[PDB]
Assembly symmetry: D2
Homo-oligomer: 178 residues x 4
């Protein structure tokens, strides 16, 4: 019944991190937030230049090797263990592998009560926000806007194309069982 973990999936610039910060403010109990950004931040800088690490193409493409996966996997078991220990966890990720990525997460969460959230946004709109964010490599938002949702099953879906982050946070918070 009680929601232990909230997992958001959406393309780059779809507005996930904004929604996450809104949720942390809205939800009464303290929720810990981790995601693709914090993981990469925690990983050695050289992982971004490594063999089977992660590589960001100049056109917005992304390649993930086994070195990166091995770590991410251990990290996933860790966040789940945190939830199991009583910490409310919010995870924002990018399911590059679509359904396969969701399945990978399912293998780690087991029977933990999870709230699966989909964060959609028009490709062209996301691209604009990517440019607005100033520093982002161009091309990622457009490339990930749709494929990351293929075959993915959600409990709640929000679309930031015409809805503010705080509004999507309200919609999501309503599906969180205390």
């Amino acid at each position: 019944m009680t929601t232990r973990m909230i997992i958001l999936n959406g393309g780059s610039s779809a507005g996930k991190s904004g929604i996450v910060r809104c949720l942390q403010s809205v939800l009464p109990e303290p929720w810990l937030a981790f995601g693709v950004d914090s993981l990469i931040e925690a990983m050695p800088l050289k992982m971004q230049s490594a063999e089977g690490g992660i590589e960001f193409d100049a056109d917005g493409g992304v390649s993930i090797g086994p070195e990166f996966r091995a770590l991410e996997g251990a990290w996933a078991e860790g966040v789940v263990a945190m939830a199991r220990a009583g910490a409310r966890i919010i995870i924002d990720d990018v399911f590059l592998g679509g359904a396969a990525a969701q399945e990978r997460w399912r293998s780690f969460v087991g029977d933990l009560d999870v709230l699966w959230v989909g964060v959609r946004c028009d490709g062209a709109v996301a691209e604009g926000r990517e440019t607005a964010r100033g520093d982002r490599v161009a091309g990622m938002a457009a490339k990930q806007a749709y494929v990351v949702h293929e075959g993915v099953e959600y409990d709640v879906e929000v679309d930031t194309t015409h809805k503010e982050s705080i509004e999507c946070a309200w919609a999501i918070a309503a599906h969180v069982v205390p």
Copy 2:
């Protein structure tokens, strides 16, 4: 005729910096961007704890003393001199003093060809974005959403309540004379 400087005015979280980065991307010639954020960044950290410096109240209020003004004034003459020297300058500021703030800027720009831009956004919407930005002191967006525009005259007005940053950038870019 040729636009030398673009000055944007709007409350906190109205979306100015996003628009500025979009303009830098859109406009063909290179535009240098400076604003309230970069100025404070350039000022001594102690200016934020000083006598007649700048003080951010816990409720989102802002107080500016003479020490801060003295510097800002010299800085303003500097950015104008940059434009005079041929650098295309974009300035994003918050006219806390309404018309008075615009008048102060006018005293510095002289007959320089300037494009005055107003960036409006619904107070409640701006507040939401403030929360989404995660780290912002709560209360500033609501407090500045309307008063900073009182008596201010613009050449172009954009409203980010229902328009993306890139879209507002297109509207503004159309009024920029090459």
Copy 3:
């Protein structure tokens, strides 16, 4: 035998994060880094204004309430679970409670093979670096420089007062069993 986790303890501005980034570069296998900075970053922003959250005094003091501890505890079990799952973890923390803080960590790591590292630095020198870092609240470095080491037991001790981060990283890396 094989080192699974490296735990660094030292006062603010002692140079922990610099050493951690050097270790991630030096050590051949990928090491995940988490610490006080990333935890606070992951915690709701409101935790910094909460009842039994964390509070940074204007003079550099720090108060931790039960709300903060509850989360930190679950988080600690999580990073340990990550190590247990095969991820090499580096943790940089500030043992405000001295030996008590180390004991708390011991209760979580169990028999996991851990490398306890002490990072010392002259109080006045740390204070200077605090000022140099530009944005840091003044007073923290001096306050934490010595008490955080009282009764704490280390496997390796490095002193950054006259040694570069990369040098301390070499000293620490030599005690890491592959």
Copy 4:
């Protein structure tokens, strides 16, 4: 007599920005700080991918084109105009062209009272700090450690190899005429 502007020159990771923040804290009057970092930040992001913009090689090399120079030049006249208007300015730059770079600055400052500061640091030590800073492209520090000082004339020279930033700030502050 009265010092109007302080210009620091040194290779990447030599510790310039740390010294600058120490100076802003130490010096009694408020000093505005601008440098290579703030300029690039103010320039369009695309300047880093442009024809005659700025390009950072993967090995730490740096190439500056005419597009970048044109802007920098106008910007230089601007900071000088700020000083002329009464704002105390601190500039931290990297004289890639050695004496030629200092000459370029001289053409802009005219007879303005300037304090020329040299910030040296052992190449290998700077490289280590580069790694410690975590995110810096490797190779820049070593490449710039010595050539940027060739034929450059200073009023004060500080060496951060064995001196803290705050200490170098004290040495520099002593040559600042009120």
